[PDB]
Amino acid sequence: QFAFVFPGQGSQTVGMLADMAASYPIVEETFAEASAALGYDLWALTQQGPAEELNKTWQTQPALLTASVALYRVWQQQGGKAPAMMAGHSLGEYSALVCAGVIDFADAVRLVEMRGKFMQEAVPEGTGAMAAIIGLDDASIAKACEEAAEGQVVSPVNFNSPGQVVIAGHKEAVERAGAACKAAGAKRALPLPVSVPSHCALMKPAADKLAVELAKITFNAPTVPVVNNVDVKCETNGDAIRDALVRQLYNPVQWTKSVEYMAAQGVEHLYEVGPGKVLTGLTKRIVDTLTASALNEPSAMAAAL
């Protein structure tokens, strides 16, 4: 039994899905529905860039959501069975929720565009930072972050695997926290091309505004279980899912535990339904008997079907 996992911001690249689109017309059909909802040509953006445009997060998010949904749609169209469960990393949670039938596709597309805008404006450029902490246990990182905060905000924001954790917050505190992490034994503290300090308390006022938009959108019951980032819970009540998306934005993404949870439910393989191979690469680092592979190239897609 397999699950579908859906990647988040960082997995996009200019040219993504080009080959899948050439094998499967539904890809561009899907991107055209999205483009109609956004008022610009999403496909052309993903194929032509430039990268700097594709990496603006109010454009990244709809781009990635649409990419993942298109891949899902290819799977379904070609007779693929439903996954036992789904989970999506950050933005990817929206993708899962679309594919599980909870949010209308066009609704989600507009939604994550607004999400992106709320996030971007949350904090002035140059006030926030993210760092990748490499080779330190979760708990030592939390302590390091607590000690370093000193009335500013910094905390773990992605638990991606054992020994791979992202922190974020105010620039200065993220610096303090990196250093404390090194002092505690971390192999690396690598600064990321971030700005937007997502998934810490700085996103609150963005989350409040997201809540207002989410309430405008019909949420349906999921047709397959979706394990959420915030609680590692499969909610089925629309308003509970809604609430989980709000809380998701200013709380850490529990990817490690979500992947452990899926394995604990009997899942044996994760298909990454999205561009890139980020989540695929995490998988074995979380549970070394779990396998994973990506479904963004036609051959892989065929081999899996």
Side-chain angles (χ1 to χ4, degrees), residues 64-251:
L64 287 183
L65 185 0
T66 296
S68 280
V69 168
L71 295 179
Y72 186 72
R73 273 169 181 199
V74 165
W75 178 259
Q76 279 222 301
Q77 190 186 54
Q78 293 311 106
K81 251 241 166 128
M85 317 165 45
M86 304 201 215
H89 197 299
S90 321
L91 173 285
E93 183 150 308
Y94 287 79
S95 302
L97 285 175
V98 171
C99 294
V102 173
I103 309 178
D104 164 81
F105 175 44
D107 283 347
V109 162
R110 292 181 282 264
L111 200 34
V112 297
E113 175 175 70
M114 275 179 300
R115 191 175 178 274
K117 292 178 176 178
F118 294 153
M119 284 162 67
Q120 187 76 41
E121 68 181 24
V123 124
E125 267 233 322
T127 118
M130 300 197 132
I133 311 301
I134 279 192
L136 221 209
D137 76 279
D138 286 354
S140 301
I141 293 173
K143 159 184 185 245
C145 282
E146 284 164 349
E147 287 179 355
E150 297 286 77
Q152 286 186 296
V153 170
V154 54
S155 53
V157 295
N158 295 354
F159 301 97
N160 288 342
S161 63
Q164 323 213 309
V165 172
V166 182
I167 62 167
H170 296 106
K171 161 171 196 91
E172 296 86 5
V174 163
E175 284 161 5
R176 283 170 231 132
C181 277
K182 278 276 248 224
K187 158 137 244 158
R188 287 160 188 130
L190 291 134
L192 316 73
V194 37
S195 165
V196 186
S198 51
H199 298 301
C200 67
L202 288 186
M203 282 303 334
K204 235 283 150 167
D208 289 341
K209 292 183 116 312
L210 184 71
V212 169
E213 295 305 324
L214 286 168
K216 287 181 189 163
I217 295 310
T218 296
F219 275 56
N220 302 286
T223 59
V224 332
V226 180
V227 185
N228 67 207
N229 286 353
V230 77
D231 292 336
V232 193
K233 282 179 94 220
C234 308
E235 307 286 359
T236 65
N237 166 268
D239 314 300
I241 298 175
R242 242 193 234 89
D243 170 85
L245 289 176
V246 179
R247 279 189 306 117
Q248 185 219 44
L249 195 77
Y250 63 97
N251 278 294

